[PDB]
Nucleic acid binder design. Sequence first.
RNA 1: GAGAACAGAAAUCUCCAGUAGAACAAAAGGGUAAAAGCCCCCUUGAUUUUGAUUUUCAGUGUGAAUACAAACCAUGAAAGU
RNA 2: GGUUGCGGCCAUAUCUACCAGAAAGCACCGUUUCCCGUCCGAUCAACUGUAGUUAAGCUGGUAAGAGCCUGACCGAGUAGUGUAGUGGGUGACCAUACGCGAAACUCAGGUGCUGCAAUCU
Lengths: 65, 194, 270, 171, 268, 504
Amino acid sequence: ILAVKKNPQSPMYTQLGVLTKGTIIEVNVSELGMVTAGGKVVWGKYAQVTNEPDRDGCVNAVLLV
Amino acid sequence: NLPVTVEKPIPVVYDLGNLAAFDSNVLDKNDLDSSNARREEKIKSLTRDNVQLLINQLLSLPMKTTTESVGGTGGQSSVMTLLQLPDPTTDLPREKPLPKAKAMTKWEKFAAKKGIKPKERAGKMIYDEASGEWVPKWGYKGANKKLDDQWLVEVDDKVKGTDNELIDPRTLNRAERKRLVKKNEKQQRRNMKN
Amino acid sequence: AKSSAYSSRFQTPFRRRREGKTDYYQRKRLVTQHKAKYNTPKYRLVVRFTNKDIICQIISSTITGDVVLAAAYSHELPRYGITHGLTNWAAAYATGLLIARRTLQKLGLDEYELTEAVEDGPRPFKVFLDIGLQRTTTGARVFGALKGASDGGLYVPHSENRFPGWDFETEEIDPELLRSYIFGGHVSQYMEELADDDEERFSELFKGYLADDIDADSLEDIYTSAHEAIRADPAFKPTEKKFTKEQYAAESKKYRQTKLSKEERAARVA
Amino acid sequence: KAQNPMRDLKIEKLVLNISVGESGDRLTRASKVLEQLSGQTPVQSKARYTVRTFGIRRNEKIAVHVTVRGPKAEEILERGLKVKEYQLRDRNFSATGNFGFGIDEHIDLGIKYDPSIGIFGMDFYVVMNRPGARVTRRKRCKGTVGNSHKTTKEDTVSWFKQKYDADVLDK
Amino acid sequence: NARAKRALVKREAKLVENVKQALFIPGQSCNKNLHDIMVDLSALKKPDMKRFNRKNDIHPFEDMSPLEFFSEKNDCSLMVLMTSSKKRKNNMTFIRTFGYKIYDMIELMVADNFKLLSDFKKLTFTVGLKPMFTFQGAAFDTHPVYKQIKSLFLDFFRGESTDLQDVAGLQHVISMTIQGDFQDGEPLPNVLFRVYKLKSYKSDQGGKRLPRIELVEIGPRLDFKIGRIHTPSPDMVTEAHKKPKQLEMKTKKNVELDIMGDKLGRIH
Amino acid sequence: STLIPPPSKKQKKEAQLPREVAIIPKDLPNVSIKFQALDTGDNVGGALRVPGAISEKQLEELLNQLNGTSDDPVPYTFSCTKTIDITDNLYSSLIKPGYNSTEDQITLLYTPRAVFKVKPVTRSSSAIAGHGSTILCSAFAPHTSSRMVTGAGDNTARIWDCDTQTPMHTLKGHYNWVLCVSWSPDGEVIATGSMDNTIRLWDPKSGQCLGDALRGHSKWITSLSWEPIHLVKPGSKPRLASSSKDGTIKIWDTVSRVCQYTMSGHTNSVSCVKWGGQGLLYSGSHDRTVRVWDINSQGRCINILKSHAHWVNHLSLSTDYALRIGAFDHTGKKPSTPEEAQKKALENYEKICKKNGNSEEMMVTASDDYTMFLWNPLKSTKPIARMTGHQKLVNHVAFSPDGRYIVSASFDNSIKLWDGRDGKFISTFRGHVASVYQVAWSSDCRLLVSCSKDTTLKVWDVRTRKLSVDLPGHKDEVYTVDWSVDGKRVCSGGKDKMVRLWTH
RNA sequence: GAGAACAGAAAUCUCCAGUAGAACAAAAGGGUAAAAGCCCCCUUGAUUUUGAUUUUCAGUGUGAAUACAAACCAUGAAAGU
RNA sequence: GGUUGCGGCCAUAUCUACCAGAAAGCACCGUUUCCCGUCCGAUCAACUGUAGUUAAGCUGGUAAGAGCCUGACCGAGUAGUGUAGUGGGUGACCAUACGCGAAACUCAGGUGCUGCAAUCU
């Protein structure tokens, strides 16, 4: 995890870094091997948390493409 | 195969940022006077020596190479090798003074006193709950102007007892909006005068 | 009745704007404007069409007037084997190919500058297309010359939405139609349709094809052999000038009007 | 000079203009009659100012016109001449070799009348030029026409007399 | 209106300045020699150059207001007034302005033994590439007047600065040389302004990485006699030479940035 | 975008300090050198003293004189032993860092190089459409760079004109994906092996199918090989070898359009078959073995090489470039007669096979056990060497056209460069961020092109062992890449259904 | 200025002359004419997001604003803007 | 020397009425299947240079034409403007030495020079 971009509950929870369902996070995508049209290597993108880590003990997210 | 190494009693100093070379050696006016036939050759030879030394320094500079192909942003392609010029040494006057800082406004001083941190400005879209749409909160097709196009408005009971009872509530809201905007402009003008 | 106030206040344009053939708003951006600040020199591939000739020149702007690096004209096409249709799309393509191959041979890129002291191998030659006051339309002979230069080997930055066969809806090209246009498929199709439909039109237009006994099925072959000949020997042979310069000058001044002296003018006045 | 075949006067264009004033169903009918008279889609006109007397507002539709070039212009011109029985004034010809006239009813030209269409008139205008007139219209090296080569009123009258053999009334 | 605001922002001050623009103004007395020399100098300056055509009754050493007016209108910080007189024949006045007010002025006269750009009839450099400079003479580094001349001409023909240079764009050198050394209390020697185009050859002694350079004169060749001087005030000098310091990282003791980009601190 | 750190104030000050010029001293004394060949190690001239400011070309002229070929020089390169190449002059290359004193002798090893020079490809010449499904395979014509053949998943092959970057012929005989394409080494016929277990031959000039398809394989064609021109007797055409998933190698006579042999030793899918220049065929299969068959002995298995612990994915021979090129060259001249074609092909093959005493043909095998094995099957059946270091499977392996280097492309996003004689590791090329599918050499062996899963091509310089130019432009994964014989064009193709032609 | 039915001093169409005498912002002592004016096509992203860099707000300072830059983004055949 | 493509200086080049233009080039000029755009193949786009023409385009020359430009040892170092030696003078004001310094008017004149490439009876 690189950063917490937007916790939909509140910007206060965003700045506290709360990871709940629907939170937008920044993830390191280096091992996926993505290249832009200009030849740059992508190593950071956004994802949305899709579960409740307080209930299942882990963070699940879907990449935003 | 003439040499490329130039001998000088006083070393030439260089400003490789501006591509300039300065030599402060003894110049004899007998060979540079207008009465001499070799003045042009003399000037050309000394300029040639100074330019040769300058070129030697420029080719001794470190070089930047890239691997990106043509057709992208940047202007340097893989086959090209550029020189890295140092910052210019010679100090020259600017054409205008530096931008002085804007003085702190009344609002900014009030925020500093009362501990108001500046807002995030995430975006200009808001969710209108009575519909299912994300609409701009201001501007062109902004949500601040929906009352003007609202089909039906209930007249507030406080408007009774006044002469403003008969006027359109949409017109009253537009007048209030313009009054607020002009007040904001007046406050900006006051901060400008201060 | 133009008044003397008008004659005094008149502010003439440039000479090239007065005889309108040059776009200065375009030329300033072609010459003085740079993408980066590296002082990289720029070259223009100027492409021009008369009623009977296609002209391609490679020019660099200088402070004393711009200088031609290499030029090619379509009256050299009979040397490479094209005797008809010197102003069509295929001729423009052949001229672009010829100027590219000639330039590559002159610069020695394909079989002591200060750049040779820093770099190991030479750069590709980059030119920018100059079209002048011509319309940018989908399927134009200027872009045919552009395609020919690009295939010949000059790096000319371009997109492909003006080539013939570009579908306006789906942003894609039709390469088979592009090849047919390169080899004059539209001309040959017109010729065959003329022969089928209007015999008098077929006799009048494409009269040279019959006079030289050229089939409609040999256009592709003669264009192919022309391209092969161009790639083989792109060097420029001057036309053998039958007369000499002083003879040309003397016979020209024989018809050119002579000035009359000031005393003679006073005589004719008096 | 005059015997050169490039000094013959030809038809530049025939422009038919119908100015109705008020936009609406009558304007649509005028577009229909122009379109079926010419075989081409006509073009409407925009307002240039606003006058209360004319009942014309800003940015409205007032007129339509059709430009016809070539043998179709010759055909419509000769049908108009047959309706006008081959008599034009001296005053109709303008000083730059161009001339026009008004047709009050379109029925006489031969087009069948219909109940819903109504009755419409039009302004015929004809432009004449000698060969080489495209110089002022081409994009590159737009240049002026010659002093001897420019069309004149006497020349278009003489060409009319040679072509249609119709007298030109002074009065 | 948006284009107007863009022009205003272009005109306003900034931390990293644009290329200085130069305005060439004919005076009340003008000559064809002045026109040709101005054309050559504008071709050397271009495309950061603008030229007037009508005559203006301007005297720099009597009044400054019309010059400041033209500078503020044209957003030009460099001015070149061409004038003629019996006392000042072919007199070119170089003006540098700071904040639309007169920073400094030098007044030179061109001697008769000058040749234009069209005299030499040789191939010249491509339009709009920054030149090299050479300054021959110790007075350029010591004397106030030649310091002013050197700074003015560097500022005038420097053009856009860069940290990367394409080697193919190195063509021409501007040389300012002093016509012989001098001492105190004497007439000031004239400054010679020459333009050369570079040619390079294999040297066979410095390897393939160091070539032999040769020069070919382009023109114009000019001989400037230093007529008149108008120096700036010391406070104006400090104001004009203030650096921003907003853009550079501040120097902090015992704090370094290594090659990998990690901020490190050293203890003792 | 993440950026490199800016220079500090001290670094800017040291940059402003005036630069030193790397100059050659004029009183630099003469230095003793000993010439020695890289392949043979023959000391020529003994210890001779040369001026310390000697240049590469003057040293090369001296060497040509001492070997006696002053009329006909061949350009060489020089190395010193850490192996350091002599770039500009001996003083700058060796003396200037001071690693060896002048009084000490220097053993200079000379290696012959290619006379012609290939420019790196730097830009996409064109993006050509026409295929309706994913492009699977591509090859250039051996005689010219103007003709390219590409097989895709829309059951078709395509012959492209590279001159105008336009399609020329569409070949629509097959019923399934065209898995492999190959051009005849005399440049006359195109063989396409398909997913429907069929091999079809095509005339390229007319774009036509020669008769009917060759049948006999029960599984899809995996690889094709041609009989070498120098082995083919004049007046006759080469035979075609084909491999398939069913584990057999079938040999086809195209003159009579029949099948002569079906070698059948393997037990699993045959990955590849290569027809060598000494009358042998080398077959690699998923049964972890490499089989050496002799065509002169009625198609019998001579050898079984067993050293891989997993599937063999690819193999490459030292003479593969010469065998594929036949009698043609980097100039692409067409011989007058089949006799002269056979003799020139024989000489071109011999210039790489027979050297350093005796003729050898090294083979390299790239496997799923993350390794490669280097063999010399004519002399020994045990492996000459084992190359390890890759972290994932070695998908592609290629010998350099002169047979001095081996390049291995792996699924660990890396390429590795090895010695082609003894198989010792030299360098690692990094820069692909996804698995590298395959690789290709230039004709002069200085440049290498690789295609990846990361939708990019990359051109590498071998002598500096560093990335030369990265080429993006493909929208999707790239499966096949090739470099022309004359070195003028590079073709690539993959999932974007677009054939990309790249030039200098 | 010549003409063209209703239609005259002002409704619509055509030709010629037309240094801008029209319309844009500004107050030039030289702003803009194959435009900076009029119409058309494409873009609704313009409050993007990265930064060991400038300035400021602590108890939430690897956060947010702010300055500057870069990667991008829009458009165009392209130079480029 | 004419002409064509690309330019510098942007009226000595501009505006108006005349005649000349051998050849080449330029242009007018013929067609509307194809790429393409309009009310209209007029402009633009494409094809043939095949039917013709130097009438226009373009170049040159002509005019006590308009306009415009350049040299002056021409005004002149003049008008005009600032210091000043205690220069007189209780007074509006004036010669003087050092600087800075025009234009009107007059004579002599003119109505394009040119860089790069290609072609030319």
